[PDB]
UniProtKB/Swiss-Prot annotation, chain A:
Interacts with paxt-1 (via N-terminus); the interaction is direct and results in stabilization of xrn-2 in the complex. Belongs to the 5'-3' exonuclease family. XRN2/RAT1 subfamily. This is 5'-3' exoribonuclease 2 homolog. Keywords: Developmental protein, Exonuclease, Hydrolase, Metal-binding, mRNA processing, Nuclease, Nucleus, Transcription, Transcription regulation, Transcription termination, Zinc, Zinc-finger. The chain holds residues 4 to 787 of 975 of the full protein. Disruption phenotype: RNAi-mediated knockdown results in impaired miRNA degradation leading to accumulation of mature miRNA passenger (miR*) strands. Defective molting owing to failure to shed cuticle from the pharynx in the late L4-stage larvae. Suppresses the vulval bursting phenotype of let-7 mutant. Reduced paxt-1 expression. The keyword Transcription regulation applies.
UniProtKB/Swiss-Prot annotation, chain B:
It is found in: Nucleus, Nucleolus; Nucleus, Nucleoplasm. Plays a role in maintenance of steady-state concentration and turnover of microRNAs (miRNA) by degradation of mature miRNA in complex with the exoribonuclease xrn-2. Stabilizes and enhances the accumulation and activity of the exoribonuclease xrn-2, and thus contributes to miRNA turnover. It comes from Caenorhabditis elegans. Disruption phenotype: At 26 degrees Celsius 80% of progeny arrest at the L1 stage of larval development. Reduced xrn-2 levels. The chain holds residues 2 to 73 of 335 of the full protein. Residues 7-73 form the XRN2-binding (XTBD) domain. This is Partner of xrn-2 protein 1.
Length: 610, 73
């Protein structure tokens, strides 16, 4: 909770406890500090706990897991009581930048699942030689929580039944809209949510006072909330340390006021824009840490790296006469200005970090590091600039991801270690170039570039062969084991996984010979799919949807935002939707998931406003 | 075209200069024995084992030991 414990301690008022009912009637006024209009769920954060909880005993079968997810959504919903919109965002295929970090995670997990059972087998055999009896394939692979797998496809169907059941049977759902963004819609859940808010904000019908609440534990969600620029934005998450399950709201509006005082500067050379200084603060946070680059060795959140950048940033400001970023594009001469400044103090940070192999704290540290981690030395500083320039390109990509939507589905940082701030000289001459057109991978291709061979069940049978047999021309992409560099850090999960980068071109080349063996179901999982929006029979836009649903036509119809509190977009007929008035048989075999005798919810395809 | 220019086009800009020479020499030692894509695979397999420390099948290790033998001469 590195970033949170920092934020919570520094700005304690941004945290407010949730009141919760411990038979709940959600139509009643919300007992929390305010009422909420929109609830966004980053689904991946609910699925992982509900399918392989590491603290409880795991659920028996998939039906029990789907029921828990239903129960958990019900729980968040009854707390937040969104009066307008409920948005459920599942991870689709991610940009390349994320895929390398997703690959590292699935490869690492399969290693642990194997080390789990190697120790289980070690305990058993230890007991059997001591003199204690012991008890005697049907395990859950957390990697199956990835776009393209059978499981993800089955979760999407359970969520459809869920949405119809609650919108028909739950009285509080009677007048809300529900959007579902499943794993065939490319993009991480959080960025789908980010983009939904952004495209709404950009339409005149949008209610600028909608009360937003986003559910998820990632720290990025704090910056997402700032970058939406939405007035009343909030996060709900579980308490970090608690005796029972307790939820708290992070109140972005409160953080704004705190940051508004933190980031005020006297004698500014160009007009003070509070909205634009927050944007620079967001960029500075991603500088210290983000999903797509390794963290510079001189910036650790526990060492007050954010406080340090602010002081450094405030200093820059009285020098180049403008803000650090404009609309998501960092000014690279100003980046270099902060990097030269952080570089003058890198040596002190290491020596200060020392009082607590590679010797960052004693002289000559930079050259050992570039020899140790990259195997280059002193002579080659063209290389040091090459990683540094590759690194700033990354930061451009990140800030652009949040503020304007993905800039490149193909870009990635091609190194296992980060440079030092002193290497970012000359970075000002770099000009980022994200104009090459890129499209996301197909789900199965990303499986191939993100799975280890241990998770080959989830692939078409002819594709599994490509992951394991020695004659396979991509067998090199699926090592049985790999070494993890601890990198000074304590635990193996803080270290670097030394896995080969995927040869995108050679992968797609190999897959050409096996693409025609896909089944219909496999071809289906491998298709870019749409978003869906649901309303109940009482919703004031129900008849509107019903016309579009009955048209059986594929033209995208612009919504009447008057019937939706300003939600804009386009909808169209969903041939797979279950119509109002028909039964909806439950795909989840559980006491809590009864068949629906008559579905009263209508489901159409949804498209964010262009 | 040529065998030297073919191998040189396999370099990736992020590849260290020392790490490229090891890949270059493996591709050059076996160029005339495997089609383009298989050399790529085998060459990457070689430097994944010697440089990154990855482990592969019992069988592939004995193949990459043999192929890799001597490519620090």
């Amino acid at each position: 909770p590195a970033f949170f414990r920092w934020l919570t301690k520094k700005y304690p008022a941004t945290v407010v406890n949730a009141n919760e009912d411990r038979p709940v009637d959600c139509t009643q006024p919300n007992p929390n500090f305010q009422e909420f209009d929109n609830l966004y769920l980053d689904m991946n954060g609910i699925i992982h706990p509900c399918t392989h909880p590491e603290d409880r005993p795991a659920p028996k079968n998939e039906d029990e897991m789907f029921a828990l997810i239903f129960e958990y959504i019900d729980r968040i919903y009854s707390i937040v009581r969104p009066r307008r919109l409920l948005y459920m965002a599942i991870d689709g295929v991610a940009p390349r930048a994320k895929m390398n970090q997703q690959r590292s995670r699935r490869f690492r997990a399969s290693k642990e699942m194997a080390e789990k059972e190697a120790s289980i087998e070690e305990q058993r055999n230890r007991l059997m030689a001591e003199g204690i009896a012991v008890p005697p394939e049907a395990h859950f692979d957390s990697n199956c929580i990835t776009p393209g797998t059978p499981f993800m496809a089955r979760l999407a169907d359970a969520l459809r039944y869920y949405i119809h059941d609650r919108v028909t049977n739950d009285a509080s759902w009677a007048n809300i809209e529900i959007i579902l963004s499943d794993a065939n819609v490319p993009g991480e859940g959080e960025h789908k949510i980010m983009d939904y808010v952004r495209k709404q904000r950009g339409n005149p019908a949008h209610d600028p006072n909608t009360v937003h609440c986003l559910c998820g534990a990632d720290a990025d969600l704090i910056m997402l909330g700032i970058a939406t620029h939405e007035a009343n934005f909030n996060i709900i998450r579980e308490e970090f340390v608690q005796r029972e399950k307790n939820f708290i709201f992070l109140r972005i509006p409160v953080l704004r006021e705190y940051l508004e005082k933190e980031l005020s500067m006297p004698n500014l050379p160009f007009k003070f824009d509070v909205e634009r200084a927050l944007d620079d603060w967001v960029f500075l946070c991603f500088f210290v840490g983000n999903d797509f680059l390794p963290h510079l060795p001189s910036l650790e959140i526990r060492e007050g790296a954010i406080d340090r950048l602010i002081k450094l940033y405030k200093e820059m400001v009285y020098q180049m006469k403008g803000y650090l970023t404009k609309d998501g594009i960092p000014e690279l001469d100003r980046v270099e200005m902060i990097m030269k400044g952080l570089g003058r103090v890198e040596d002190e940070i290491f020596k200060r970090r020392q009082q607590d192999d590679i010797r960052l704290y004693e002289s000559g540290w930079k050259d050992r590091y570039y020899r140790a981690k990259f195997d280059v030395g002193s002579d080659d500083i063209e290389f040091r600039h090459r990683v540094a320039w590759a690194y700033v390109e990354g930061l451009c990509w990140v800030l652009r991801y949040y503020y304007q939507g993905c800039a490149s589905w193909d870009w990635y940082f091609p190194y296992h270690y980060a440079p030092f701030a002193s290497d970012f000289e000359t970075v000002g001459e770099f000009q980022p170039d994200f104009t090459r057109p890129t499209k996301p991978f197909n789900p199965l291709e990303q499986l191939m570039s993100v799975f280890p061979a241990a998770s080959k069940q989830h692939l078409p049978v002819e594709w599994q062969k490509l992951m394991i047999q020695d004659d396979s021309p991509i067998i090199d992409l699926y090592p049985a084991d790999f070494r993890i560099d601890l990198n000074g850090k304590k635990y193996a999960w803080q270290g670097v996984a030394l896995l080969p980068f995927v040869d995108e071109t050679r992968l797609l080349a190999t897959l050409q010979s096996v693409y025609p063996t896909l089944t219909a179901e496999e071809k289906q999982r491998n298709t870019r799919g749409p978003n869906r929006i649901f309303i109940g029979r009482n919703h004031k836009s129900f008849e509107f949807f019903q016309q579009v649903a009955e048209s059986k036509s594929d033209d995208l119809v612009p919504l009447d935002p008057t019937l939706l509190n300003g939600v804009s977009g386009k909808i169209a007929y969903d041939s797979t939707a279950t119509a109002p008035g028909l039964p909806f048989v439950s795909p989840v075999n559980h006491d809590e998931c009864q068949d629906l005798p008559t579905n009263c919810g209508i489901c159409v395809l949804y498209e964010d406003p262009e | 075209r040529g065998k030297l220019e073919d191998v040189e086009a396999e370099k990736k800009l992020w590849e260290s200069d020392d790490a490229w020479e090891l890949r270059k020499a493996f591709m050059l030692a076996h160029y005339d024995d495997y089609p383009k894509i298989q050399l790529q695979c085998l060459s990457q397999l070689f430097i994944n084992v010697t440089l990154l420390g990855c482990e592969y099948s019992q069988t592939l290790m004995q193949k990459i030991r043999t192929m890799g033998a001597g490519i620090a001469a």
